[PDB]
Design a protein around this nucleic acid. Sequence first.
DNA 1: CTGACCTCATCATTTTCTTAAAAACTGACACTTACAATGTGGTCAGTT
DNA 2: ACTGACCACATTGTAAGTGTCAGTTTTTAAGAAAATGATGAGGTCAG
Lengths: 430, 435
Amino acid sequence: PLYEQLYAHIKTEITEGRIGYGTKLPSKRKLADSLKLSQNTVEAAYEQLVAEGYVEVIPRKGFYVQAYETIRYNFHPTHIDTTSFPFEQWRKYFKQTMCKENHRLLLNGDHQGEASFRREIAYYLHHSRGVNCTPEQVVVGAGVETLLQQLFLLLGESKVYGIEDPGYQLMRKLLSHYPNDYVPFQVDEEGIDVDSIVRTAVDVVYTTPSRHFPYGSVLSINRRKQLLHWAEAHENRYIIEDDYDSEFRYTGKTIPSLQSMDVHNKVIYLGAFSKSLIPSVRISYMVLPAPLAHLYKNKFSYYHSTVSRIDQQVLTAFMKQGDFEKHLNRMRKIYRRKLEKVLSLLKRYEDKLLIIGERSGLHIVLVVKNGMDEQTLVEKALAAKAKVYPLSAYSLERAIHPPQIVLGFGSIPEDELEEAIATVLNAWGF
Amino acid sequence: RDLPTPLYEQLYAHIKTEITEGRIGYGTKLPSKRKLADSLKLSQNTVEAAYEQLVAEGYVEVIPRKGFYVQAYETIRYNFHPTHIDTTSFPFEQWRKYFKQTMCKENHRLLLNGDHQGEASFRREIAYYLHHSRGVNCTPEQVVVGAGVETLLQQLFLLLGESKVYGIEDPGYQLMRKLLSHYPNDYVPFQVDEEGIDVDSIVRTAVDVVYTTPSRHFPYGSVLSINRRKQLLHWAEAHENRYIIEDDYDSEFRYTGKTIPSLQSMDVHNKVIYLGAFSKSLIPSVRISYMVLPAPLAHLYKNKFSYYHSTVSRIDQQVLTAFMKQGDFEKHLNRMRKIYRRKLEKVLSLLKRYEDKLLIIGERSGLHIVLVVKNGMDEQTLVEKALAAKAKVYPLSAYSLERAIHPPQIVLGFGSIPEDELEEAIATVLNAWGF
DNA sequence: CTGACCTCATCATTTTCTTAAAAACTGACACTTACAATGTGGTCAGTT
DNA sequence: ACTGACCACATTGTAAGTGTCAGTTTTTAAGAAAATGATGAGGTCAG
């Protein structure tokens, strides 16, 4: 349109430099007559010119020029089963929670989180895992990484962190960028080496009391009490609790969280919420002791929330009624059936493939007694359009001589387990 | 036996309390299965299950073909934010259709996460929209996504280093100083005239990265001329380890004179990084954002943070991709622009009558206006009187480190006030004041 | 030999799951009004 | 005489609105089947 055509035509002229600074623009009220355009279009074009500072106008009209110069299957514990997700149950609550009548939920607020969401999480934790909490005690954010970065900023750059050697490669990745340094630790079949911790001047150590990734070892009560006494020995040491994959134990009901024994408020409860409902929904949560929570509130008062308020409201409406328990039970049953079927199928190769670990969880890890190296196993698996993930990446120490490979089955359909196992074993040469 | 918890639980609790109180010592022999089952008239299965759970917990240890052994030794009416958007005008009925379209039973294999840099789609449509609406020239793979501006700025801070010195605008939007208060880096305060940032103070100082808004200046609304933009670009080009960050506040809400092209459009030496937002246009509570980086910084970010995961859910990403794929975003933006223009004209016409004691500083474009109060009363008195009428207001003192003008000037917002309540709110706040 | 490891049988209560009809929803097509964009024309007050 | 901005009413094409409709969908008191905790009676193997 001429509204912008004239503006561009004069902009290219002022840019190329046929007119210098101080020269008047060709005319006013005369260029419209000479170019047979109306005066309004010229006025609008000149207003556009002076808006961006290409030409500046004296309050009495003068014009001053300015410019002058392909995998069939995959196996790993991250995936969860997606077919059995009740979409028709999520959609109902979504349509119930977001309506034109219920406005003013489109604007941000409650930097920590929605009060109802926090209260319901506290109630659920207290009545399920035996974790004493307070509605204002718990904080909620998107992703565990953000919460751990907030923790790192809150504690400082003058601390050393304890990480078990075979475990989840997350704290190492976070501490690589930060100035802090970590100390490796070995683990036996009963838990972490509490003796090594107590004979060392570590400050904060990271562990999963409920289930040990990936071996599934469960800490006994004597080691737990010894660790609490070690934390009580000093005044400025803290223990972080990781709620990786609880509520998924079949035979032996559920084991209470370590915080239940925390009489002297010295445990912070890290958790997770995206390894149950949706892997890509990005909600996590964390509980802190009263003094540390108070200091965090008094220190991080400016940051806004990280997870959308719509998701908070729809999910607290979803699991306020009680569908969370039903979905959890159905997932537990189907995963138990999958585990039993996989174990029964793989039991016949007991002489060469020995299963090690415990039933509870979403994955199993098996040692291969064949003479091929772990690289050969991975290459042959990926050559059959079914890639597998070795355990060597989960520990930074020297490679274990028997090639130990982790296997997951969350993503594999129930009817394709036999075919996947058969083709994997055929690729391995059995 | 009458409790809802089966004997599978009462027996375990009883042995729990017996062990904890110390009635059974270390290594003491348990009565095994048959003896206890006969003594307590309970089936072998429940007793063996309770003992197996006990062994799993670790209180006692079982050895094959022999008995157990213990191993346990001991009110506001009209809120005034220059940050809200109008809520009633939001087309919820259009959001619902896309949400029901994207999340269905057949739409499996999407709950699992992935593509930490964002799905190729959302990136490609956001790049297309940026190129065709703001003159931003960038390949789709360069843009990144995140939950809000805070996470992106923290990632940029970690990627750059702890030695750089950051430059901010005049006393104003208090974000970068709040972020840098927790980091070893330091900020250099600056001053701006009624046109923009003073490039002379930039070139007489050795600052490395300076934060500015080349489109609209918070809160004065000043727009940088081409000469100052070219001078800043030349200063950035002068050295080899200095960068300029661009933050477009409301660059798509210019009423009369179309849209002002972005500063990145004039960049040729790959020296600017774009910082946009999706929380001041569509919904201020979904927490979406984006950032554009040049090729070397893109490679550095890809090779440095390759082992992260996006903080934005794929449901929202896909529904936004569907929303902006068919063009409803432009229609919604036009509707919001028109309603905000009408609101601004109405409020300006209403406030024109009281002009002797009050003045308007900001320009037409934007969502807020700043006005001075020449009445003989201090800023705290204005704030307290406003709050006493159940409608509190926000002064510029919080935005100002120093004291600029002795007559207090207050920022007023109208994004979250209905058209039928503007006159009533203005009348009641004026009555609360001396007028 | 008594003693402790196990794996079938089939009983039971109470949650989960499935199909029927009757209910409300909303989609595409259509059309009737409206509406604010650019745009031409004719002014307006005030400088110097 | 040279030049500020402020009406008039003309235009094309996007946005807004009501209509009935076929259509995918929501809701429900039945129905039946699954699973656990539970009793009973075995199985091998040590020492």
